[PDB]
Amino acid sequence: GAMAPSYRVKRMDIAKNDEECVVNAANPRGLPGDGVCKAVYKKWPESFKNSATPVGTAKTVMCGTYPVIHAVGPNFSNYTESEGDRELAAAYREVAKEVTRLGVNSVAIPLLSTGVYSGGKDRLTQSLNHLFTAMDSTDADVVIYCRDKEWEKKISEAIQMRT
Ligand SMILES: [Cl-]
Ligand SMILES: [Cl-]
Ligand SMILES: [Cl-]
């Protein structure tokens, strides 16, 4: 475990993370995809061997000894708000199981279903709250990665409001 488990947020490419493992915002078919998924495919392409997994699940594949946790959030274009909310919560619970099983002291994680799977809606708070619900019982240092300047400020505020 980390000596004093924390949450932090950084605005940069998660392919440049300084953590012991990464969470990919994966598609169910293990395809290169776009956004975070394409950055992860360029950096860790070996981790896409048999990475296909259903919505609401996570599947870990090693790139060398570096673990890539492929977490499949729902595409809110296809799911109802109710069913999508359930699957987005479930993907983060499976990430927390994998992080615990791997015994890592730190993990880099993006906000699932906030980009091209958002169905055109701002889901920062919904996705971050499901991240906290799953990760709060883990003792890894969690570093959340984002690309937008306003999102960085809002994620940092949400972390600080609970400390
Ligand atoms: Cl960058
Ligand atoms: Cl997304
Ligand atoms: Cl972002």
Swiss-Prot record:
Record-annotated Macro domain positions: 4-163
Post-translational modification: Phosphorylated by host on serines and threonines.
Effect ascribed to mutating Y117 to V/W: Almost complete loss of mono-ADP-ribosylhydrolase activity
Annotated binding of ADP-D-ribose, by residue: D13, N27, G35, G115, V116, Y117
Transmembrane region(s): none
Domain of life, per lineage: Viruses
Compartment(s) where it occurs, according to its Swiss-Prot or TrEMBL record: Host cytoplasmic vesicle membrane
Membrane topology reported for the UniProt record: Peripheral membrane protein
Function according to Swiss-Prot or TrEMBL: Seems to be essential for minus-strand RNAs and subgenomic 26S mRNAs synthesis. Displays mono-ADP-ribosylhydrolase activity. ADP-ribosylation is a post-translational modification that controls various processes of the host cell and the virus probably needs to revert it for optimal viral replication. Binds proteins of G3BP family and sequesters them into the viral RNA replication complexes thereby inhibiting the formation of host stress granules on viral mRNAs.
Free-text note regarding domains: In the N-terminus, the macro domain displays a mono-ADP-ribosylhydrolase activity. The central part called, the alphavirus unique domain (AUD) has a zinc-binding function. The C-terminus region, also called hypervariable domain (HVD), is mainly disordered and binds several host proteins. This intrinsically disordered domain contains 2 SH3 domain-binding sites and 2 FGDF motifs necessary and sufficient for the formation of nsP3/G3BP complexes.
Subunit structure, as described in the record: Interacts with mRNA-capping enzyme nsP1. Interacts (via C-terminus) with host G3BP1; this interaction inhibits the formation of host stress granules on viral mRNAs and the nsp3-G3BP1 complexes bind viral RNAs and probably orchestrate the assembly of viral replication complexes. Interacts (via C-terminus) with host G3BP2; this interaction inhibits the formation of host stress granules on viral mRNAs and the nsp3-G3BP2 complexes bind viral RNAs and probably orchestrate the assembly of viral replication complexes. Interacts (via C-terminus) with host NAP1L1.
Protein name listed in UniProt: Non-structural protein 3
